[model samples]
Target: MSHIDDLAQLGTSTWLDDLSRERITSGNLSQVIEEKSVVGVTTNPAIFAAAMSKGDSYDAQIAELKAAGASVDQAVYAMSIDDVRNACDLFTGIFESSNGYDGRVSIEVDPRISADRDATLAQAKELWAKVDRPNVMIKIPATPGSLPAITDALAEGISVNVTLIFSVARYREVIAAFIEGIKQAAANGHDVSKIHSVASFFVSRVDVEIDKRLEAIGSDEALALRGKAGVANAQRAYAVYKELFDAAELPEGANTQRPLWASTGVKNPAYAATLYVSELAGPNTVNTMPEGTIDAVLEQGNLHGDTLSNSAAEADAVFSQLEALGVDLADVFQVLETEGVDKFVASWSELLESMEARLK
Candidate 1:
């Protein structure tokens, strides 16, 4: 069996971190599910922007929306939701097979509203209703401002994928928010079994930021820890996941918020292409890889099973070393969160402008 299949056997789900009209029209997505063991899809503004810029597949939809005189924002939403709904239908089998734990398709709320709780809530509800697919997940940023919105969405029985998480401390709060939402749902007489959430903690970007700091430190010990933080951080996050969900902290009928590894594509050429995938395999997790990372794993990944189960102490040490070496972990998370939202907002703006140009 391929390493992708091995990963599934290892109890981790492999999801594609991309979706687009061309993928839908071309049958590329179905083929990936058939061959690559890609069971789900995740998309953000940057992904949608890149998808729309390339192919003639979206031209027909653009023409129709333009004929309707839709605003740029409306055009982008209409087009994106259509693709997500179609992809959701494609994964319906997996959704049923896994009992709602897999076969998910996620679309994000507008990033510009990340820090605005009320606006984030409004858009999340709008996206949920517009997509109108049982398998569709409305992604909310895990910013402090958006946490309440996360709970609010879930209380309303919306399946959520909480994205852009970087700090374990914040992840704890996200978990709290999730359980509280589930509790609220139960109290409100909503069936909590229908609500699901995943906390998407980013991976490769941690190594990128920490490695740069290590290089600036210019110490052998510091440099040695350069390529270590990303996986270590992820492993620690899984420990938290196990405690929060697997430990029965969740209310009855509430699904565990599976730890999803995002931004997993290796940025440094010197690192192993499958570094994130091979190391982070464990039960009850999802690793959303870009196409290149997926291809690398299918070709040459090594599945070291359950790297997360007993690594908490060592993972803790890795952070200790970074802290001793003067790397401000808190500041790193803060910067990453800020940059994450800024980057997506910029991409959203670009996507809107791109759609407007096409409509014109």
Candidate 2:
């Protein structure tokens, strides 16, 4: 068995961080789930933009919408929901198999709402209604602003995939929000056992930003730390996850926000192909790999149980050293959150433009 497959056997679910109509039509997604133990997909605007722009698959739909005099935003919504509903059906068996925790496909609300709590919550609810799938998780940004929305959604019995997180501080808040939400859901007569949530802490982008700062510092210390920050950061998060969920006092049937590792693709060519996967292989945590990363891992990665085992001290040291080198971890992650949202908005806008052009 592959390291990834073995990981699922170890109680961690592996998810693909991407999806496209092409993959679904070609049976590629189903193959990955069966062969590599990929249980679900997490999609953002950037993925849909590329899918819409690069193929004729969406043309027929766009034409119909245009003939019906639909707005660009409406067209985008229809197209995205079409793909998500298909993916949900694709994973329906897995969803039934895992009983709602493992098989999930996520679709994010408008990236523009990342900063507005009420609006973000409304949009999330709308997206959830639009997709109309039990296995779909609404993707929310873990910015300071979206935490309340995250809490509200979870309390209302909505499964959420809290996305765009970079720092452990924000992640902890996310965990708290999850607990509070689940408690609220329980109080509202919702089945807390049915609620599922995940905190999607981003992975590769941490190293991308840190490496730039290190290069400017131009010291042997900085050079040695290249490509290490992201994995170290993720390992540290896994440690936190264990400390929280493994607690003896956790509420009965309480659903913890499992740390779902995002951006698993390696930024630097010099690093190990499965660097993130190998480093963060712990129970109840997820590594959402890109397609290339998944293939590389399947071909060559090794099983290393509990890579995050006993890694807290080293992780703390890494953060301290990075801060000492004038890298502000909090600021770095905040900036990532802002840019991450902007990138999604831009891609979503592009998707709209593409649809408009095709319709015209």
Candidate 3:
């Protein structure tokens, strides 16, 4: 067994970060779960776009959609939903026995609609029901405009994976929004037990953005803080998680929204491939692993358990130092959000453009 098992034993679920038609159809998805201890999958427009460009695996499905005269949006939906539904089927057993913990597959709603709350909720309902799997989570961004949509979806008994949290303050807002949703679900008479959700925090991008600022500042102390931001930021997020979720007032069967470590693949060439995974390991969390990171984890993860939950003070000190260094901490959050959504929107737009050309 790999250190992935040790990671899981610490209550950190490992989700395969990339999904493709080839993976689902060729049995590679299930193989990773058995061999590498992957328990779930997460997908986005970027991933599907890459999958679309890579193989002839989607050839027949694309042809059928072309013949049916489906719009590009509908075509993308059908293809992605099929993959997520198939993935859910593969993980259904773990979902049941874990009592709604692992065995999840996430498909994001169109990032283009992330800013419009009503359409966001509209598509969330559509996506949830269309995929129609108990284990499938419709991912919503944690954008300011989208928090209520998260609440609304959860209030409807839909499981959600809320993405793009860049700050612990934003994470607190996300937690409040999630609780409001779950509370409303209980009030609305939905099966709170069946509802599960995760709040996603990006790991590497924090470093990607912060490291640049640190370098420009060019102090010995500021430079020292370069690689530490991603892990420290995530640790602080879990501290918020523990505070809010540990004593959350909810219905008897309601599940605490777990803190999920997103963007875990190391962005820096100099950092350990598993830097985020190795450092952010802890309970009540999920780390979605890119294929390369998974290989790295399996190779030499050095599974030191429970590294996050207890590190709040240390994590806080990292942020404190950054603030003391006159780094625009608020702007760091804004930059990450701005770049994060912009990147996702661009990826979504490109997916549509490419699919439209293919259809013609």
Q: TM-score ranking from best to worst? A: 3, 1, 2
* Quality of model 2 by C-alpha lDDT: 0.82
Task: After superposing candidate 2 on the true structure, give the runs of residues whose Cα lies further than 4 Å from its correct spot.
Answer: 246-251
* Candidate 3 lDDT by residue in tens digits, 256-345: 898999889888899889889988998888998788899899987776778987898999899999999999989998999999999989
Q: How many residue pairs clash in each candidate?
A: 0, 0, 0
| Residues 1-360 of candidate 2: C-alpha lDDT, one tens digit per residue | 676777776666789987777788788988998888899898756666776678876777877888898888888888778889989988999988886888899988887778899998888888888788899999988875788899899877789999888888878778878878887887888888778988998899999988998999999998888888998898888887777666524356876677888998988888888888878777677778888988888888765777777788888898889888888788888788778777767877887776667766
Q: Model-by-model lDDT, in order?
A: 0.87, 0.82, 0.88
Candidate 2 structure, TM-score to reference: 0.94
In candidate 3 the C-alpha lDDT for residue 253 amounts to 83
| Candidate achieving higher TM-score, 1 or 3 | 3
| Model 1 pairs whose backbones collide | none
Return the top candidate by lDDT.
3
Q: Which stretches of candidate 1 lie over 4 Å from their true place?
A: 246-248
TM-score of each: 0.97, 0.94, 0.97
Q: List the residue pairs that clash in candidate 2.
A: none
